[PDB]
Amino acid sequence: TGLPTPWTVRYSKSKKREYFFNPETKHSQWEEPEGTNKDQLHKHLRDHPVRVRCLHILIKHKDSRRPASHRSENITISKQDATDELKTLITRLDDDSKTNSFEALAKERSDCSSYKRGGDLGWFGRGEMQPSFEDAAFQLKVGEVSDIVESGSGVHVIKRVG
């Protein structure tokens, strides 16, 4: 909302950038369309964003689609084993710690390839992540940490930083 007609605000996966689309003219532009309620869009995107940026920690389990990370090329633990481990992991969380920061915990234990980037998945929109993951990420506020989220890849804990 805030947008005239028939404009829509969208997210460019290729550019990691918000843009504006006219479906009648098939025109796309980065700049806001003439006619817009400026701050009705801003606190529409603030409260209902079209892009978010997240960190996550992935612990895979036996019934995961891809039970083979850089840590083990065959993963044997249960779902509750992975969960209580992730729970214990999250209990260390400390933004001021060099070894217990979310980034560090990701680097220490996360089975996702993003472990080497501090669990940084970068910006993403609604056509990209697993539905279970997305529905938790977009419900989070900036700076907020999620509870345990189950997906096909494994279990996650998510931090939204953007």
Author numbering: 9 to 170
Give the original sentences from the paper that presented this experimental model.
Saccharoymces cerevisiae Ess1 (Essential in yeast 1) is the founding member of the eukaryotic parvulin-class of peptidyl prolyl cis–trans isomerase (prolyl isomerase; PPIase). Ess1 and Pin1 are small modular proteins (~19.5 kDa) composed of two compact domains; an N-terminal Type-IV WW domain22 and C-terminal catalytic (PPIase) domain. Ess1 isomerizes the CTD of Rpb1, facilitating the recruitment of proteins needed for efficient transcription and RNA processing. Ess1 has a rigid linker between its WW and catalytic domains that enforces a distance constraint for bivalent interaction with the ends of long CTD substrates (≥4–5 heptad repeats).
S. cerevisiae Ess1 (henceforth called Ess1) was co-crystallized with a single heptad repeat (1R) phospho-Ser5 CTD peptide and the X-ray structure was determined at 2.4 Å resolution. The Ess1 N-terminal WW domain (residues 10–45) forms a three stranded anti-parallel β-sheet as described for Type IV WW-domains that recognize phospho-Ser-Pro motifs, and is highly similar to those in Pin1 and CaEss1, superimposing with an RMSD of 0.7 Å. A peak of positive electron density in the WW domain near W38 and Y27 was observed that we interpret as the position of proline 6 of the heptad repeat, as observed in the Pin1-CTD structure. The remainder of the CTD peptide was disordered and could not be modeled. The PPIase domain of Ess1 (aa 64–170) has a globular α/β-fold structure nearly identical to that of Pin1 and CaEss1, which superimposes with RMSDs of <0.7 and 0.6 Å, respectively. The entrance to the active site in Ess1 is formed by a large loop (aa 68–85) that includes basic residues K68, R73, R74, similar to those in Pin1 (K63, R68, R69) that interact with the phosphate group of pSer-Pro substrates. In the Ess1 structure, the basic loop is in the “closed” conformation as in CaEss127 and the original Pin1 structure, rather than in an “open” conformation seen in a later Pin1 structure. Key catalytic site residues identified in Pin1 (including H59, C113, H157, S115, Q131, F134)28,35–38 are conserved in Ess1 (H64, C120, H164, S122, Q138, F141) and located in analogous positions. Finally, in the Ess1 structure, the WW is even further removed and occupies a space on the opposite side from the PPIase domain α1-helix, generating an elongated structure. In contrast, the linker regions in Ess1 (K46-R59) and CaEss1 (K43-Q67) are highly ordered and contain a solvent-exposed, amphipathic α-helix (colored in magenta).
